[PDB]
Task: structure prediction
Amino acid sequence: GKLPPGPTPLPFIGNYLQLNTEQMYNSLMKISERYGPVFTIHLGPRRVVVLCGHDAVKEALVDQAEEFSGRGEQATFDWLFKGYGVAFSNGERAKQLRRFSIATLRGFGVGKRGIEERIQEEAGFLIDALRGTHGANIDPTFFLSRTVSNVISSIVFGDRFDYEDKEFLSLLRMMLGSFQFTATSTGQLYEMFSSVMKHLPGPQQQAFKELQGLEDFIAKKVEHNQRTLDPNSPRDFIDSFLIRMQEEEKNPNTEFYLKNLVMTTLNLFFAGTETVSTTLRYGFLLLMKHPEVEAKVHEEIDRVIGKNRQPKFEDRAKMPYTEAVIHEIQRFGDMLPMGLAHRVNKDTKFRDFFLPKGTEVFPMLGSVLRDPRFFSNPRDFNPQHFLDKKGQFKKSDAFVPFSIGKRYCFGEGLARMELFLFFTTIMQNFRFKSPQSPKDIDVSPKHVGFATIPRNYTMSFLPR
Ligand code: HEM
Ligand SMILES: CN(CCCC(=O)c1cccnc1)N=O
Result:
């Protein structure tokens, strides 16, 4: 009959006094130690029920999947999305957009054997660009992002970008900056205080222009497809969506119309770029700091695949150690520490608590990736976390970086394959050197907010 207990809030500022916007995850975790694994917090005027640990997150998003499947808010993005598109929508809109996106994506080979050649081909170009650096110290950021991005770009636009295309880099800076903004102290103040801050000068204004620039580029690309549309030969995700829009022109209550097309396409292009990219970046830093772990990956690539042929997704089954390393890089990297907010569809009873309809919910995936009964050394980089006695791959019920339940990341299939093919191909060809001794390397995060951003760094790609 009652809400989950929590610290007393003040009018408008909510629980701003018990929260440090530079490290929200730590704040919310401190409050958990006092109040328990399920609690109520006020992010400014927003009432949020917070879930910590494997159990409370699973009992909500799995055992009570339908009730907890609404989408909560993410102030910075909502500035742009305003409830349109697959990722920021609710109800019938979310369900039609999701069901359309998963089937259309699957049809383009995504998550099946079909997108595979295209990932091997794009790995190949990156190896080439990496030879082109001659072993210099470089910031790997945009090298990796061009590559990852071209995979989803093919799928939604129809072709990859040239690596030297200047607009491309521009787009890549718009993504990086706006995503990175949500990880900052001001980006977290924005979650609490968007009603005033959207009208105030600050880094938020940069993030908006960057988003608006990403929306404008998508709208332009859609006009191009629209005035060259062959329904009997869809080139890409946008064409498919436009074809379904044609089919649904005589339904006045359809979710399939321009704004949703533009917003869904952005959702896929932005998420299909930024997360995998950052995960690669984080992981190459984790590997230079754990050279012995790098070297056991090497041993597997060398024994199982060798130096001549391209790696393939099927090789994973005989590479338990690489697979554990990628898993443990995703775990340690904790890309979305509070996932995407949810909300409850209706009046919901959850363990003795009552949650009124529309109550926001933070599933704290970071606290699942660090739950001390599922991982022996949660705050350490330890690949043994996903390995048994024998050295065979050991799955974990608490490996939840793509979230779980009805709104789980349907990019998961693409990501798993991109990470696997991108790590093995890169490391088949190059071992890594930083201008720092392993002891000096700081793998603690630069920013922690909506996302976990690794620190700035440089490295060299040295042929093996
Ligand atoms: C390692 C890389 C990735 C991570 C860690 C990740 C993580 C997540 C997480 C935690 C969510 C929230 C699920 C929830 O609301 O409970 C999500 C949603 C989503 N992700 Fe990803 N993702 C990754 C890659 C991708 C890729 C490659 C795509 C493109 C296909 C993508 C597209 C989406 C979309 C469209 C949603 C919204 C789902 C919905 O609202 O129904 N993600 N992702
Ligand atoms: C990047 N991450 C999703 C973050 C929220 C999201 O899905 C999103 C955010 C901005 C634009 N498009 C999608 N998913 O992999």
In short: The longest strand covers residues 38-43.
